[PDB]
Amino acid sequence: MSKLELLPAVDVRDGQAVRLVHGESGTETSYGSPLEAALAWQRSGAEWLHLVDLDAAFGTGDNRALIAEVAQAMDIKVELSGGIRDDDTLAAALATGCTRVNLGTAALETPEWVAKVIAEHGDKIAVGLDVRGTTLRGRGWTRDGGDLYETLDRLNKEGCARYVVTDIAKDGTLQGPNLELLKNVCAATDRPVVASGGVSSLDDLRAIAGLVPAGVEGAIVGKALYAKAFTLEEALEATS
Numbered sequence: 289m290s291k292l293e294l295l296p297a298v299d300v301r302d303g304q305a306v307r308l309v310h311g312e313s314g315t316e317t318s319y320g321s322p323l324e325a326a327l328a329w330q331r332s333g334a335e336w337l338h339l340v341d342l343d344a345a346f347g348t349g350d351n352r353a354l355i356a357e358v359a360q361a362m363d364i365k366v367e368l369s370g371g372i373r374d375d376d377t378l379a380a381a382l383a384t385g386c387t388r389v390n391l392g393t394a395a396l397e398t399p400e401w402v403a404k405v406i407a408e409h410g411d412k413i414a415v416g417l418d419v420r421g422t423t424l425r426g427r428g429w430t431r432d433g434g435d436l437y438e439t440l441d442r443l444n445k446e447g448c449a450r451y452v453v454t455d456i457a458k459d460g461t462l463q464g465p466n467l468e469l470l471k472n473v474c475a476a477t478d479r480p481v482v483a484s485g486g487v488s489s490l491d492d493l494r495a496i497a498g499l500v501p502a503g504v505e506g507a508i509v510g511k512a513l514y515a516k517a518f519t520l521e522e523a524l525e526a527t528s
């Protein structure tokens with residue numbers, strides 16, 4: 289069918305639900321309680337929660353106990369990300385019972401570890417590809433980490449189940465999705481692709497939904513929901 293999955297985002301820094309611009313540290317706008325934000329999305333009919341520990345992604349401590357409390361409060365599917373770079377952080381992340389985790393920096397820095405984790409955990413693992421042009425970025429998007437196509441080829445052959453694709457130039461900007469990049473990634477894999485960053489309107493969600501036949505499975509939405517560009521109910525109606 290034509291349905292696009294919607295994943296409202298809760299990104300956590302210093303115990304707060306925040307949004308960044310280009311994922312730059314220091315551009316936080318705070319939106320209150322991460323737990324109340326997640327409960328509100330769930331109450332409005334969310335099927336998914338995209339939950340991110342940004343302190344862990346930046347290496348400035350973590351919010352592990354709070355993240356765990358938020359995930360325990362969800363009856364819906366949970367996608368968990370942020371600082372998952374070794375066995376201990378992966379163990380705690382999966383212990384939330386989350387539907388899947390996203391690995392970002394680890395795919396660039398420890399490709400052998402990511403290959404091992406894919407083989408042992410299957411589609412509980414997705415890899416986040418955060419892109420500037422055709423260059424991948426890591427460590428909270430503070431450093432380069434490789435070429436998009438070479439990395440996709442490697443992860444394809446390692447059996448990676450799913451990719452989360454962010455154009456860093458769109459992220460947090462309300463400037464719309466990068467539909468060319470999404471289609472370019474769909475051309476390079478037969479794995480489901482989740483779009484992330486830039487959504488600003490219901491027309492943006494409809495345009496991403498137009499790529500479902502090409503292999504786009506879902507869209508993560510952050511700033512536009514916190515900014516009340518539309519309600520989650522309106523977004524769910526638009527993507528059904």
Ligand SMILES: NC(=O)c1ncn([C@@H]2O[C@H](COP(=O)(O)O)[C@@H](O)[C@H]2O)c1N
Nearest residue numbers: 311345369370371372391392393416428
């Ligand atoms: N600067 C940022 O906003 C940022 N840096 C990383 N992340 C998210 O955190 C994850 C990557 O963390 P790590 O690089 O530890 O795997 C990815 O899913 C990515 O969307 C961000 N939102």
